[PDB]
Amino acid sequence: EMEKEFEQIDKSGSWAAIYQDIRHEASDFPCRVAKLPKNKNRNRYRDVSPFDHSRIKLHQEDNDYINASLIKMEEAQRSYILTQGPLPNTCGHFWEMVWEQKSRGVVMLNRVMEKGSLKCAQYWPQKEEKEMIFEDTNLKLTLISEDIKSYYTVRQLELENLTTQETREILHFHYTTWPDFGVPESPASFLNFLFKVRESGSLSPEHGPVVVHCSAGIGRSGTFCLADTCLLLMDKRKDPSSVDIKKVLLEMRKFRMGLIQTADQLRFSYLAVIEGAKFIMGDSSVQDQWKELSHED
Ligand SMILES: CNC(=O)[C@H]1Cc2ccc(NS(=O)(=O)O)cc2CN1C(=O)OC(C)(C)C
Ligand SMILES: [Cl-]
Ligand SMILES: [Cl-]
Ligand SMILES: [Cl-]
Ligand SMILES: [Cl-]
Ligand SMILES: [Cl-]
Ligand SMILES: [Mg+2]
């Protein structure tokens, strides 16, 4: 049981050792496509690649490759697409993937510039009147509106397939205060934002999988998806004790390497899940309290 386990690990001071064991046990599958010479400039990080079995394929002829993985959680019945922050030359592929996979939401857990460097291309329009055309993929993207809170911004985007003229609303949930290789400021701020994504409907099984990215699409992204699936699992069963966090993380790691990048992101994951369980088991009030503690205004 996660809370018993949590205190035990904290008491013994062994998050590092628990975390390294997950890395030692983690799946190792091939990434032959990611490593083809022709795809070198489609990858942000040499040592962060999608496994071939789980990679999202673009529906070109030409080159179907994008650094993106379908994390398909069978028992939870939720899927997520995890991806790197798109590069200047892969922004059209990124929106092409959103369109073909029928995603309704994109969750971005990084900033475009972190520690003085460009960790993600500016892949969405910052101004209504200056829309983006991705000519390679025949798509157009327009900012419709935004709601800026203290530490996250929600945008409404309209994506248009120029070849068909069909349009879709995409919601963009941008967490702007989660440091690279870091943890959110509190369980409350992370959970306030996670429940905003949930409330939008973007995770409904009537849509394609939500797109989740940070810079590499593994650390902050893994943390977000792990907390969510753990909460979903206990919500389905109404049974917090039936969730094994480390087993869930190992299962997700069958679909993409490196998910959760530090022992403190692991420990933060347990914090978020232990706290969010209050909500799941019927303590209505904690949602307002998270919103307050997060200081979103
Ligand atoms: C340590 N650093 C690294 O391993 C790499 C890969 C990574 C993997 C994961 C990652 N975290 S996250 O997935 O964005 O939370 C950030 C980075 C940033 N990196 C880098 O900036 O390293 C580069 C490629 C820029 C030299
Ligand atoms: Cl930004
Ligand atoms: Cl900076
Ligand atoms: Cl970039
Ligand atoms: Cl940072
Ligand atoms: Cl790792
Ligand atoms: Mg304006």
Curated annotation (Swiss-Prot):
Organism: Homo sapiens
Catalytic site positions: 214 (phosphocysteine intermediate)
Effect of residue 180 to A: Substrate-trapping mutant
Tissue spec. comment: Expressed in keratinocytes (at protein level).
Enzyme Commission number, as recorded: 3.1.3.48
Limits of the Tyrosine-protein phosphatase domain: 2-276
Listed name of the protein: Tyrosine-protein phosphatase non-receptor type 1
Residues found modified as S-nitrosocysteine: 214
Included range, full protein: 2 to 298 of 435
Subcellular location: Endoplasmic reticulum membrane
GO molecular function ontology, one term from the record: cadherin binding
GO cellular component: a single term: cytosol
Enzyme type, top EC level: hydrolase
Major place of residence: endoplasmic reticulum
Function: Tyrosine-protein phosphatase which acts as a regulator of endoplasmic reticulum unfolded protein response. Mediates dephosphorylation of EIF2AK3/PERK; inactivating the protein kinase activity of EIF2AK3/PERK. May play an important role in CKII- and p60c-src-induced signal transduction cascades. May regulate the EFNA5-EPHA3 signaling pathway which modulates cell reorganization and cell-cell repulsion. May also regulate the hepatocyte growth factor receptor signaling pathway through dephosphorylation of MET.
Family: Belongs to the protein-tyrosine phosphatase family. Non-receptor class 1 subfamily.
Residue(s) carrying Cysteine persulfide: 214
Effect of residue 49 to A/D: No phosphorylation
Subunit structure: Interacts with EPHA3 (phosphorylated); dephosphorylates EPHA3 and may regulate its trafficking and function. Interacts with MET. Interacts with NCK1.
